[PDB]
Design a protein around this ligand. Structure first.
Ligand SMILES: NC(=O)NCCC[C@H](N)C(=O)O
Ligand SMILES: NC(=O)NCCC[C@H](N)C(=O)O
Ligand SMILES: NC(=O)NCCC[C@H](N)C(=O)O
Ligand SMILES: NC(=O)NCCC[C@H](N)C(=O)O
Ligand SMILES: N[C@@H](CC(=O)O)C(=O)O
Ligand SMILES: N[C@@H](CC(=O)O)C(=O)O
Ligand SMILES: N[C@@H](CC(=O)O)C(=O)O
Ligand SMILES: N[C@@H](CC(=O)O)C(=O)O
Lengths: 432, 432, 432, 432
């Protein structure tokens, strides 16, 4: 089968070693039960990571046959920018958007780490995602897409493993019993997946709808909800060239990673982009999360403001429709499937290519901001004798036949009982 | 024809008398040129109107054959609530929404005032909307829908009228010359259309993209962008029953108008809901506006938060798609056309009927707020042994055939040149 | 768990007893291994069934604790008519449509037979659908929807069962060994699922794309592809009232089942509606089928012809879009889920309610037919001074601003390299 | 203004000279009233045209300053093939499709003839389309797109012209009075627009819904409805390479025009593709037409059959949705607008690029045909141990949570009155 239920003794197993008790304990346990574990750590520019080079060394200290750090920042930012160009975000609440940052991280991580293992002749994969979430399926799909011969082994789902190593306490004691003066970190009231595009918090106390953003200590921005933290209003300019974010506050960057890093700083000072979403997981059961994505939010606002001053209505409607559909595919782990690529490619080529301009905003607290200026050499919006009042009288008169058709429909609907009353005496009323 | 180009001497002409120089001068001029003008004023609960009863009297003072005040508040709020239940809002920028408040006002005004004229045997209609905007067409459609025999006469578009009465100065002098000690009001740097659902500001200085919300003096809320205005954080609860907004902060209301009035007060203290949009008019040319809708925004946020904890993904996707399409139809003046009614009715019956619950928010400045609690007897979201790890391994394995199909597609796309590279070595790349 | 992997000894198990070796052998085997089997047979008006009453008796002869015949014809036809009103058909090839007849049969069968078992205190269900198709999942969903406590047991998927009773030969010998002078029928080169709405043929030799409709012996119509079968051209009239098919050739019926039965006869004489489709199963793997649905096809053609003479473009576009989406949900076994009901209800209320009229056709062979007449008291199509040439000049002139915007876009696209050339010298060309 | 209401005396006016009384009489009349008329005739490979070179000569005989024949066949076929690749056809009745052949002809004609006039310094355009149809607006848009300075003058809409030259009789007498022994052709009971892609018949007697295809003498195919015309069954193979039609019956062609010409012959022998549609014109009023497009129909059927054996469900759903939307844009004259190009480009790149294969059909009469074989090196359909019965049990079990959610919804809908009954006792029933 594709998924190995129990430890493949004697075989090389590649595991996404993010570091931390779960992956650390798994390395020792696998190495202990007879498997040859290889560690691969993705450099995703995590806002809460300050020493990536130390991670592969810890894997080696714990028995890894070999350990590698795969830099995925360039690809992550490129896909994040593509997501921005396509408005590929489907989970919204009252307009506030989740920027699908974890889904983007998985697309890049799942393909690059598996490709890297491919290089080292490692054909068995394993990551710590649970059998209850979306990530296990995202990694599964991206991995198999990259390596047709891939097999999956998740010690965390192996009954043998769980029997021995139940929870965090058993695992930390396991580290100690294995000869390592291990000291487990302080446990938060929620779990977090983070990368340069965003941080997603959920589980534990965030599973209760009565818990709010107040129990969260943001890692990409400030506590804007705390009236005691001072946040001075700030002006920022975002400029695009053919849809590509090239300048922030008039400054260009040597690469897009530095640009995103700066967009994150600007947005973070204000807590821009944070939202609270209840969403539908791939397995059709709901999950609740609190999300951060300051840089993505900043670019999203500027990009759409320009879009509204540049494209026609049919094109904007298609951008919203295709973007929402693509956002869902991205969330499902299908970002590289034909149905996704066709929408992504289309929006990048025909919509984003014309987004050249600059937007000036004043950021205050959280999602409270104002648009101060909008400029573009491609605007179709023009403050300024192409048509006359009489031309409009003609255009209005052309509507008469269809208006009559609708009036007759309203009469018909009232007749068959659908409407309480038509437009004859006022506002049509749908029978209740 | 339907549209009378020149004054119908001797005939009864009904005009939407909002009050103000344009309609006042038109009454005198029409009465002067030989027409019999009738005034109809819609009570829309305008936030900037404090004495509706005075308006019909001014029409009578100016020569109106008769003057009437048509109360449209109940219908306006009912349609506004329907819009909320359907998420019928299509103009969004970075998520910030325009709540189509003027379009909703026109649907109710255009049908009720024309129906009222019908009662008085008046079959000629006229309002002050320009030949350049959307309103002239909204009124046109709603009027004809209600009265098949309606004819339209807009003195403001009559060459004879414009020759004599050019601008505001000529008109005010006309009032004086006609024997009225008329005193024209202070002129703002933008025009405004307002009603109990919202206020829409545009034209004049707002036509420049360098002008911002800063030149606007909000009439439904506070200047949250001015750091000197104090705005204490405030907790608010919004509760729905089968999709109907019934309680704010635990209090119920004798009618929906009082509810909306209170939603407006709560939202207004914070400036909730204000946005700046560049949009596409019906005639396919762009327009820029700054909008207020505090109560609508408040209900919208609570309604969608509940929706996310109650409906499945396909149903939510259909709510967003149908709502955006309906929003556009609403904006086009087709709110009562079959293609709109079918979407509106559908969302009200199958989506809104299940929205029973309460949302607790903390409002701060503008659109900066936090969700504090979400409850519903209908939640499908549940913080809490229906499926096992092995059940998921099966579900994941069922994806294999299609994943292979996609891998082959990626190879094919790379072959025909579409992709630089497939997933074989990492992240697929669309050829640039 | 929900699905019992092995025989629930001692328990009452309800099985969909269509009759035939598979269900017959299963009854004996289950009764033999210690289970108490109950038989439920759905009367679906199968075109190839001539003696339904005989089936429950055979179940009793084979050991059934009890046997029942559940009449599902009325419900089947009602859902088929709803499908017609909604154009709920998504699998089309060059326009030729699959009328989702098996999916409709499952929705009705899965709910009614399980509800019937409910009555007899039977809470374990089992049908002969394979683990490779769509039916196992349709029955699963409809059954659980009707009975929350339902458990599923499919002897045909029980390793114990397969070990003993492999194929048809082992089973027929099993019948003999169990004391029944059993004689298995003639085996066809494909399998068939049939009901009053249609017959679906697939599997066996139909799995090869080189096999065609020529290997099929149609059970609802004639072999129109065989030039030797004579098929006289025939005129037929189909009349609807508020979307309901009420008359065929000027004759009304005592009930809708008789109407569908007659629609089947008319269509069958010609082989109307037959198609060959390669489709995507729920598990994302393709399947090939040859389908019959003479009556459904007849009503579909008349219904849509009327629709085109009655509804406006936006409404027709929504009918096609919603119908295709609903067709897919129907095929997935989600015909009663909220996302389906909302589309179905909407189309029935606002689109079908106005479909009152009569269409006259001449049927010849297969899908070769001609429309001879179309009438409706609700037509908006009228062969017959509402607008003048000058009104149109105005309407055309109003397009100028946007045309300029598009011309500029074409220049822009040519500039960034998207287009080889704009419209400047002729036909714009997308860079290859 | 853009549209000149009366003859521009002294100016060069370019007119689409198809030949025939209307354009011939207009040339003399314009040349007579003081204008300098230039003739441009599009070679569209009309099935009913046998001598294109003779047309410019007749224009010269009638006074044209100059006359040119612009060959548009290559471009017409290229756009027709693009339409096929995108399924850009929106008017369907019971599945039978209108292949938007006139709209495709206008896109190519309107741009190329205007571009040609551009070359000769002619900036005033005029064609014979009426102020009541779609063509006047298609030509208007395509012309202005190609030439920003274009002005339009249609003598047929000039009151002066109509006063003098009313109908066909007045015009033929005008030709005679102008010194030409003119002999007008036999008048048919309908009008026709034809090109190499198709022929569209409408107006006159076809305006009555009681007239049928029987009054039409097809110009691209045979009278398949006439039982006396013999039509031998015929086998045909259609093969594509990366979505491009390259071979018919195993033979390749020196160019696509020859390919389409042959596709037309094959389809024509059978009358394949003919349909009768009632549709919605751009001005929102219905029109009835009878259409021919034998070659387009042939390619459409083969193309879609391959599509169904090659692409996944999401991709096929997007092909149908985008194609229908694009078909409408094509019909509206917006084939080169951004909202159209984005859908067209997308379908060509991601869907059509993979359509490599061959389909074998047997054509009989009209749209009665059978699929005999389907082959493709890219099929994802495979008649032939990737997943086990137990894998499916897991996949089915994962549906439980959502099924419960739907069951609860059905209970809720029954409670609020929407449903008569839920699934508890059988088939859910929507309250009537
Ligand atoms: N802490 C986490 O586990 N976050 C990862 C998932 C985030 C979000 N629910 C998603 O599926 O994208
Ligand atoms: N001040 C205004 O004229 N506002 C009315 C129009 C508001 C907005 N552009 C709309 O069309 O709904
Ligand atoms: N013979 C059959 O097994 N037919 C039943 C399935 C028909 C078609 N593939 C469907 O899923 O509706
Ligand atoms: N005979 C014609 O005038 N045909 C041209 C129009 C065909 C069809 N109604 C269309 O608009 O494409
Ligand atoms: N990362 C979490 C949430 C998710 O995957 O959706 C898990 O592994 O379950
Ligand atoms: N009320 C403004 C704007 C609009 O109608 O769209 C006008 O009359 O032009
Ligand atoms: N009835 C067949 C086909 C299907 O279910 O889709 C099976 O049981 O596999
Ligand atoms: N060609 C016809 C029909 C159409 O244009 O739609 C006309 O000129 O009116």
């Amino acid at each position: 089968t594709t998924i190995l239920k129990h430890l493949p003794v004697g075989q090389r197993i590649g595991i996404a070693f993010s570091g931390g008790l779960d992956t650390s304990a798994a390395l020792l346990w696998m190495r202990q039960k007879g498997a040859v574990p290889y560690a691969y750590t993705a450099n995703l520019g995590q806002p809460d990571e300050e020493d990536y080079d130390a991670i592969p060394r810890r894997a080696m200290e714990y028995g890894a046959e070999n350990a590698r750090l795969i830099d995925c920042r360039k690809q992550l930012v490129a896909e994040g920018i593509a997501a921005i160009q396509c408005g590929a975000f489907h989970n919204t609440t009252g307009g506030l958007t989740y920027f699908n940052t974890t889904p983007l991280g998985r697309a890049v991580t799942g393909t690059m780490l598996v490709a890297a293992m491919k290089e080292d002749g490692v054909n068995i994969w394993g990551d710590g995602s649970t059998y209850k979430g979306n990530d296990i399926e995202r990694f599964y799909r991206y991995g198999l897409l990259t390596n047709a011969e891939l097999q999956i082994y998740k010690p965390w789902l192996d009954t043998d493993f769980i029997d021995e190593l139940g929870g965090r306490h058993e695992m930390s004691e396991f580290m100690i019993a294995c000869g390592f003066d291990y000291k487990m970190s302080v446990e938060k009231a929620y779990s977090t997946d983070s990368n340069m595009l965003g941080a997603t918090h959920e589980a534990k106390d965030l599973e209760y709808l009565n818990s709010s953003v107040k129990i969260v200590n943001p890692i990409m921005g400030v506590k804007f909800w705390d009236e005691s933290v001072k946040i001075p209003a700030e002006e920022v300019t975002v400029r695009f060239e053919q849809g590509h974010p090239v300048a922030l506050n008039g400054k260009t960057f040597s690469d897009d990673v530095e640009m995103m890093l700066e967009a994150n700083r600007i947005g973070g000072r204000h807590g821009l982009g944070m939202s609270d979403q209840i969403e539908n997981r791939i397995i059709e059961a709901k999950s609740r999360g609190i999300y951060e994505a300051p840089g993505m939010a900043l670019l999203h606002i500027a990009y759409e403001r320009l879009l509204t001053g540049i494209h026609n209505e049919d094109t904007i409607e298609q951008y919203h429709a295709h973007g929402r559909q693509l956002g869902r595919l991205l969330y499902q782990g299908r970002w590289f499937d034909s149905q996704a690529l066709m929408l992504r490619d289309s929006l990048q080529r025909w919509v984003a290519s014309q987004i050249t301009g600059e937007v000036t905003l004043e950021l205050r607290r959280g999602n409270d901001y104002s648009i101060l200026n909008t400029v573009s050499e491609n605007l179709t919006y023009k403050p300024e004798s192409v048509f006359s009042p009489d031309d409009r009288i003609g255009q209005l008169t052309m509507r008469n036949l269809d208006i009559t058709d609708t009036r007759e429909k309203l009469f018909g609907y009232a007749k068959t009982g659908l409407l309480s009353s038509s437009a004859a005496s006022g506002v049509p009323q749908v029978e209740n």
